[PDB]
Design a protein around this nucleic acid. Structure first.
Ligand SMILES: O=c1ccc2ccc(F)c3c2n1C[C@H]3CN1CCC(NCc2cc3c(nn2)OCCO3)CC1
Ligand SMILES: [Mn+2]
Ligand SMILES: [Mn+2]
Lengths: 189, 481, 483, 189
DNA sequence: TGTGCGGTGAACCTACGGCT
DNA sequence: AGCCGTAGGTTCACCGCACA
């Protein structure tokens, strides 16, 4: 499933995570296969904050990402074995894409936390007004979102480890009420 | 260029949470619809797929809805449309479908290329006068189309068909109701703003499921009507009968709402095999299109079939509870509403719709009258009218002369010029006059309605009463003490 | 209807399936070069005004209208068929304009139809040009609720230009694409010499021209194919040998053979190195980019002869693949194996028929218009009389009858006078009508002139063909090396 | 995938073969579940004339038909073990449905020939004007094609074995020329 | 633990000719 | 061998909440 790049020097390599093959096509045609790797998934991924340890390790998409990064998870994590110095989350520019980002972020924080601390995780910024990346022409996706010259990548930074633990538990955790309260307090119509 | 992980999580998840709440899983209190359902119905309306016309292709329907209003998966759109056509899911179906549209056994519908659909006669009541400025239109997802924000909904659809929705941080579960009871309830409310739940319950006895069956007690219904939350125990319609000679059987002809019949049967078989239940010698689904739902459960000779039945209620979906949780969008926001609140918001929506329609019919009537007054002047001085046009080199000069000489507006002058020669015949000249007189009475009739709030409210009552008589039916679900 | 013999059932069900596949699915028509699926697509795009000047229209809507009205088959067959016509690596002259993910040479499928949008290409307008001027026969659709075209005007030799490949029952077809400038020149020489030979035609049409460029080896295979409709043509990739540093060399491929999957070709090359069925290769990379273009790199080991490795690669991998020409196409609704001339002949006869039927249509339309104008001239010259005649009449029927007898008018002339608006009575309309009528008389004469002389009609086809050539004709892409 | 009937008496039992679930849905809703079994297949089935045994015994649809009939194949075929006395081919009323019928008959002839000789194989006659069975309402399918009181079923007859052997070879076999010759000599355009 | 319903996402059979 | 391209067919991963 992973469409890897030419170079094997992680310092200059990057891996874009997309929603699927409809998006993956525009991505593969528009990239630089020398330094830009692409791993298309299959939509909404497993929520690690609600699922059991054994279920997570058996999940097909979860394994592909770990195999792609080559660092292992939890206690067996090793940053020196990282295959890419830039893991780029590039979901579709819609509400369901924003949700998938949170799902991936949740995954990176609970099993590959040091990857976020080292500044390896990035958030791509595709243009609004597109239902998906498969709706865009290869060139317009490259110039606006993937081209190192003109793209605005957002680096994920971890500030407070206490506030972060409370955020992921609140939004992605098994307790509904806390999540309902958050919505009530922050909702703007 | 830098993004804090805590902020990203809070903003993106809120963005998604809000969107599912206000534009996906929760229905509006006014039309009782979700965005996908409203977009499907509107699509059928704009394409003129009315019940008098022939069945149109599901593929074209779904294809148009998706492109114009619903920027989502085609499978979601098609499956929502199919559900609206199923007489076991919708108390008052909204889609009239031709072909394979699924079963009570969980079988899906045939691929969209094979099936065809149109509106049912009742759906016309949801769309009635949607083009008479009754409801507010909004921009679609891309600024290229226009879509309704809500439907006229000339019958209380939210409570009639109910709704189920899983969102974020909340969910919804509203049961369907009998249309005759709802409208009667609405009529009482309009005559008494301070009516109580208890009194409204004299009209609305409780939920009425498309799959009939039984409800046990009035406590669960009362709790739900009062608070918006409550547990209602549903039960299958089951009888015990002889089958010779000395042997008996349990016959089921109605199952609980939303229960999969095939699934229910397997669950019974599982228990028989696992020896978790005693006395069952055979289990057969005799259901037929011709004979209706019929599930047969053979009992062992001399065993008490009444004891076996009671056990089936405890261990199988033969008895299932419906957990009411009445959350709907009120003024755009999710809210837990009671029976009265739901009826109040619907009544108030009906008043605005009828007033807006009257105001629209008035404006258009006046505009037409003005145009007719222009043509009437023209017919009275047709000779003079010709001479003015004949001596004019251009249309612009003709216009200006017509306005000047006959004291006409710009619109009146244009209408005379657009007038064809055939309009001059005996019968055609009489049509222009006949229409004008009818229109003056009509204008007067509409002004009488706007000048009195009580007359308007009475019209709302009379129009609701008309629908009750035509679409109202008998209660299906039995409520036992 | 109690019984059915197994043998009789097998023969009659099978022939029914086979006949349908042959005449209504897998084989292209010699006149417009299209299979029903594609013709129905292009027609659907035309009926909804999905022209090049208009914005892109949603793919799902396209597929859905085509499926409902003309093509009662699965949506995937329709979509994927539209997708192909939009690819510059599949169609020598694309017939569809696409926006979004529309596949790749690496075998990637297009994005789901909900994401993509499409429209007609400028060259497609030429296929549909004059479709609403009674040039071609329309037929009832599958259910009888719609009408569709049996064939398109095809103002350019589409069958040979874009070619085709189809697998039917009992037969198959494989027609390669060609250069439009070359094709039109051939058609021109043919229209000037019905006895023109194959060898003489090849002075214009040098051989196939692939959207993927590349090379062709020899002319014998090409000659055989044109002469008989069958032949084996050797396609070869464009590859060069260049230096990479330190006395080491590499092979660089910038163009591959038609219909060859790049990623799949590369994988087979990697397989040979891994299984040791070839030596001298140290690395294999695919450096293809939008900016760079197709670029496959094959690093050779220092001091190893790179030309030998290349030669072996041609023999052992799809870096050199043959195109088996088998030119079967529908001629009067029958499958028929045809040569280069016979293809050009049937196309030219289709063009002669289209342009003739067009001139005949314009002639009827003009005579009808001149007839109406004569009725309007009488009306305006005696307007007062006309108006009183209408006013004194109670119904429309009465007015029509009075107008016909009093003013010597036909039923159509009387009707057009009744449909006439009051603004048509202005001071300059009477002269405006006189001008149009005179122009029409002159125009009618010009059309009759053409239909009375077969040489003026044929020459007209030539001019319109030449016009297509100059506006859409391009340079040859595939190089033919001898030998 | 098999949707069986209540009765276990094969003399009065019958099994309908449809192209898939879209057709199977209308069929299950309109059938008499007491004596009518339903087996939805998966479109075009393998041509046994062009395939070798290993390929045949491993095809899912072939296996389910064998399992459903309960007769076995070839020399092990036992007619006394049939679960239905009426095997009804009910493919869609289109040219591709006609082709699936030929593919099914081919299979029945090469592996269950005595089943035909006994008159156990029938051909349904759904009305034309429909792309598939899924397009019809359950009642319309029942009354015109499935109801024994009104339906017209075509019983398959074997006249001459030698001619039948040749017909199956010519049309379904690997030699394209014979099949091309048949088309030419019998095609009426 | 599994289900109801609008959402994100995608795969792999087969026929056919030629080479609570 | 598989693979070129129009055809017939369909299955299973995930989210979210509240009920037994
Ligand atoms: O990816 C996968 C992977 C596996 C798999 C298995 C079984 C299975 F069934 C499927 C699978 N899939 C996908 C799915 C098969 N698809 C094919 C195409 C079919 N098209 C619908 C459609 C769309 C339209 C339209 N009409 N009809 O017109 C209006 C706009 O768009 C929808 C089902
Ligand atoms: Mn997406
Ligand atoms: Mn079919």
């Amino acid at each position: 499933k992973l469409a890897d790049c030419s170079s094997k020097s992680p310092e200059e390599c990057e891996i874009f995570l997309v929603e699927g093959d409809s998006a993956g096509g525009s991505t593969k045609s528009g990239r630089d296969s020398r330094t830009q790797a692409i791993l298309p998934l299959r939509g909404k991924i497993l929520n690690v904050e609600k699922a059991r340890l054994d279920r997570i390790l058996n999940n097909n998409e979860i394994r592909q990402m770990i195999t792609a990064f080559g660092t292992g998870i939890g206690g067996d994590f090793d940053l020196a074995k990282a295959r890419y110095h830039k893991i780029v989350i590039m979901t579709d520019a819609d509400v369901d894409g924003a949700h998938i980002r949170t799902l991936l972020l949740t995954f990176f924080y609970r099993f590959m936390r040091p990857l976020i601390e080292a500044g390896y995780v990035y958030i791509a910024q595709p243009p609004t007004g597109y239902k998906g990346l498969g709706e865009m022409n290869a060139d317009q996706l490259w110039e606006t979102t993937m081209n190192p010259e003109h793209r605005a990548l957002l680096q994920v930074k971890l500030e407070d480890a206490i506030e972060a633990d409370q955020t992921f538990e609140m939004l992605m955790g098994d307790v509904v009420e806390n999540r309902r309260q958050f919505i009530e307090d922050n909702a703007v119509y | 260029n830098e993004r804090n992980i805590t902020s990203e999580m809070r903003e993106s998840f809120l963005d998604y949470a809000m969107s599912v709440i206000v534009a996906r899983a929760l229905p509006d209190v006014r039309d009782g619809l979700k965005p996908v359902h409203r977009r499907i119905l509107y699509g059928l309306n704009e394409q003129g797929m009315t019940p008098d016309k022939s069945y149109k292709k599901s593929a074209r329907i779904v294809g148009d809805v998706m492109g114009k209003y619903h920027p989502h998966g085609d499978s979601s759109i098609y499956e929502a449309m199919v559900r609206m056509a199923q007489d076991f899911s919708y108390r008052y179906p909204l889609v009239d479908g031709q072909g394979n549209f699924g079963s009570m056994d969980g079988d899906g519908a045939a691929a969209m290329r094979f099936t065809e659909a149109r509106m049912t006669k009742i759906t016309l009541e949801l769309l009635r006068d949607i083009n008479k400025d009754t409801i507010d239109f909004i921009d679609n997802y891309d600024g290229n189309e226009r879509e309704p924000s809500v439907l006229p909904a000339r019958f209380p659809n939210l409570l009639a068909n109910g709704a189920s929705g899983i969102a974020v941080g909340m969910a919804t579960n509203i049961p369907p109701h009998n249309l005759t009871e709802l409208i009667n309830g609405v009529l009482s409310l309009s005559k008494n703003p301070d009516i109580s739940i208890a009194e409204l319950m004299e009209d609305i006895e409780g939920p009425d499921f498309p799959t009939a069956g039984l409800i046990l007690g009035k406590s669960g219904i009362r709790r739900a009507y009062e608070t918006g939350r409550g547990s209602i125990q549903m039960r299958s319609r089951a009888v015990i009968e002889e089958r010779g000679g000395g042997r008996q059987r349990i016959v089921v002809t109605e199952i609980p709402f939303q229960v999969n019949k095939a699934r229910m049967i397997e669950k019974i078989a599982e228990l028989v095999r696992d020896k978790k239940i005693d006395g069952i010698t055979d289990l057969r689904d005799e259901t037929s299109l011709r004979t209706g739902v019929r599930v047969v459960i053979d009992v062992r000779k001399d065993a008490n079939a009444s004891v076996i039945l009671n056990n089936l209620y405890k261990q199988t979906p033969l008895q299932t509870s419906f957990g009411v949780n009445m959350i709907a969008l009120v003024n755009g926001r999710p809210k837990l509403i009671n029976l009265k609140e739901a009826l109040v918001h619907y009544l108030e929506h009906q008043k605005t719709v009828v007033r807006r329609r009257t105001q629209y019919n008035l404006r258009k009537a006046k505009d037409r009258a003005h145009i007719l007054e222009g043509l009437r002047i023209a017919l009275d001085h047709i000779d003079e009218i010709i001479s003015t046009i004949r001596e004019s080199d251009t249309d612009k000069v003709a216009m200006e002369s017509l306005q000047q000489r006959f004291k006409l507006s710009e619109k009146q002058a244009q209408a005379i010029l657009d007038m064809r020669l055939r309009r001059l015949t005996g019968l055609e000249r009489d049509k222009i006059e006949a229409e004008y007189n009818e229109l003056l009475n009509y204008i007067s009739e509409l002004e009488t309605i706007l000048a009195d709030e009580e007359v308007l409210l009475q019209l709302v009552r009379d129009e609701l009463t008309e629908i009750r008589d035509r679409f109202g039916d008998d209660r299906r679900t039995e409520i036992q003490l």
